[PDB]
């Protein structure tokens, strides 16, 4: 039992090091994403041209379909309804 | 018969497309990798081309404003089948 | 992409000959399916 607990504690140390590696790298990726967003904002006329929490977990083709479906339902024809079914 | 049956209402909105064959050939290589289909189509759904054009995925055809047109073609197809 | 080109490659591959277009499509399919250590491109005018 002490052998099992020692080996499982070493496995938990390796898993905590992996979670920290994921987090560090993940944080760096998030920072890069923020910079990209800032660049997009800079690139961004706009003045003349001027549900979500469930759509946070959609697949990207499903997310594009959801955005286009809500845009077409609010834009031209109001006889359209969408719903997200799953777990 | 097969007018309003859910298997083949929307089979040929665009001319052809057969409702059966997979759009991308990478799926054909991935099927050949594990050794493996219209039963799966009737089980899970029909992979049409216009569905994936609405989804955003662009796949190459064999020979070298979509939303409003597809929904209007659905509106014409339902009225035609009821008529 | 630093933090697309496939559409430009499709607009270029519109003008390919049919055996070259079949080779392009099957090569992209085999590169995305199994072997990611593969790259294709179209050279010409």
């Amino acid at each position: 039992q002490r052998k099992r607990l020692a080996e499982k504690y070493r496995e938990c140390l390796s898993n905590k090091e992996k979670i920290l590696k994921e987090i560090e790298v993940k944080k760096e990726y998030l920072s890069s994403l923020q910079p990209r967003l800032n660049s997009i904002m800079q690139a961004s006329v706009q003045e003349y041209l001027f549900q979500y929490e469930t759509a946070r977990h959609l697949p990207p083709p499903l997310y594009v379909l959801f955005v286009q479906a809500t845009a077409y339902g609010q834009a031209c024809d109001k006889t359209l309804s969408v719903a997200i079914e799953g777990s | 018969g097969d007018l309003l049956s859910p298997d083949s209402v929307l089979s040929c909105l665009y001319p052809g497309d057969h409702g059966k064959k997979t759009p991308n050939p990478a799926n054909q290589y991935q099927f050949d990798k594990v050794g493996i289909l219209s039963d799966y189509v009737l089980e899970l759904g029909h992979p049409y081309l216009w569905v994936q054009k609405l989804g955003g995925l662009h796949f190459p055809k064999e020979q070298p404003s979509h939303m409003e047109t597809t929904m209007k073609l659905l509106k014409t197809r339902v009225q035609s089948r009821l008529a | 992409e630093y933090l697309d080109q496939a559409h430009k490659q499709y607009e270029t591959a519109r003008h390919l000959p049919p055996p070259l277009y079949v080779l392009f499509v099957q090569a992209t399919a085999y590169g995305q399916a199994c072997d990611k250590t593969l790259s294709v491109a179209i050279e010409g005018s």
């Binding site: 987090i23 993940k26 594009v64 | 955003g56 | 559409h7």
Partner: peptide, 28 residues
């Protein structure tokens, strides 16, 4: 998991922006 969900939301937003740019290029 929260960082992965935020990264997947940013990737889906970038894909939706690319799809909107493709729809604008197809319409024009």
């Amino acid at each position: 998991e929260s960082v992965e969900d935020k990264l997947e939301l940013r990737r889906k937003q970038f894909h939706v922006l690319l799809s909107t740019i493709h729809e604008l290029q197809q319409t024009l």
